[PDB]
Design a protein around this ligand. Structure first.
Ligand SMILES: *[C@@](=O)([C]([C][C][C][C])[N]C(=O)[C]1[C]2[C][C][C]([C]2)N1C(=O)[C]([N]C(=O)OC([C])([C])[C])[C]1[C][C][C][C][C]1)C(=O)[N][C]C(=O)[N][C](C(=O)N([C])[C])C1=[C][C]=[C][C]=[C]1
Ligand SMILES: [Zn+2]
Ligand SMILES: [Zn+2]
Lengths: 19, 152, 23, 183
């Protein structure tokens, strides 16, 4: 089989946009 | 868009976490084994595989951003679960730390592979296994970040 | 005359780890 | 804790310039640290206890552009290198450190938090040296303690050969002082 990515976690809690 | 340092992965048999450090997506061998990782251009193989240390790693996938290893020697760690919960842990040494508040093993299930962060949010180690006395996880085994650096 | 100091961005410390929403 | 930060840009060259002159900024504010800019240089301003403080070396004696036009500084202390305006509507303030921790974390304009060991009131050593270019733009940024409390504001880099080994900062106490000071 293969490992699929089902979700992602942003440690800073960044909601959106650019820096 | 926003990028994550922690990927939540799955292999049919189980779900767990991977953590990108130094441009590599690291996770535990007991979850991925030698499996290849999914990619929109087909499966990509492990850059590193180390059964001896329970460590495997592929090149960081898309939508991810690498985490920085710790350089403060702090022993007041913080474990991030697959549910984005932060569990503060006290480092007892090298690969072991004790939760400040024990929790049912379920609360730490699927979180193996995730990061052990220091007060600066830097990678201290990779959550390897939960040490639980009767269904209550009170401590956790972890792969110090040095192993990853030594494995590279 | 000296112009005003303008805010052109921000750094947010209050954020906590979160699962990036899908879509 | 752990201290995590993220950055969000809100204006480009032309919007900044127009806003710098007109002195009227109608954008929304969020966060405890604002990426601030003048017509010449860009740095940071940290909000501590309802006041947006920054390094006098960058803000000089300028006003801050706001939705109601320019806002005059509340405090100005050339000697202590401080200036402060009431914190913008929408910002979140940090609170001074009440624990005397010797381990400090510096938050840079790229939203990075790098560890520094307090070497003495207004100095601390970087545990991992960085190029001076990395710190550029980070003046007026916060120097946090393990609990996310303001210890100081980054002022200058202690460097050699172009590599920064330490950092000089404005201890939060000088803030309380400046306020009490007739300035
Ligand atoms: C801050 O106001 C800077 C921090 C940058 C440090 C690399 N602070 C200073 O430059 C201070 C002030 C007070 C003393 C001097 C001048 N200083 C220093 O950092 C110098 N250190 C020093 O004197 O140290 C001792 C006290 C130990 C003697 C240091 C010496 C080596 C060379 C660098 C200075 C700030 O960040 N200012 C804003 C800024 O740099 N902005 C620029 C910018 O806008 N432009 C357009 C160049 C910038 C922003 C973003 C990216 C790049 C550049
Ligand atoms: Zn650290
Ligand atoms: Zn404190």
């Amino acid at each position: 089989g293969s490992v699929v990515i089902v979700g992602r976690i942003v440690l800073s809690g960044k909601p959106a946009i650019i820096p | 868009q926003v990028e994550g340092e922690v990927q939540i992965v799955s292999t049919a048999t189980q779900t767990f976490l991977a953590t990108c450090i130094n441009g590599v997506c690291w996770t535990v061998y007991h979850g991925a084994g030698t499996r290849t990782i999914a990619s929109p251009k087909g499966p990509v193989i492990q850059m590193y595989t180390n059964v001896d240390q329970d460590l495997v790693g592929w090149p960081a996938p898309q939508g991810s951003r690498s985490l920085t290893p710790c350089t403060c020697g702090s022993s007041d760690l913080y474990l991030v679960t697959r549910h984005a919960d932060v569990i503060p842990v006290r480092r007892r040494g090298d690969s072991r730390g004790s939760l400040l508040s024990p929790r049912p093993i379920s609360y730490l299930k699927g979180s193996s592979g995730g990061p052990l962060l220091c007060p600066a949010g830097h990678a201290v180690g990779l959550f390897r296994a939960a040490v639980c006395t009767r269904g209550v996880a009170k401590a956790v085994d972890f792969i110090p970040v040095e192993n990853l650096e030594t494995t590279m």
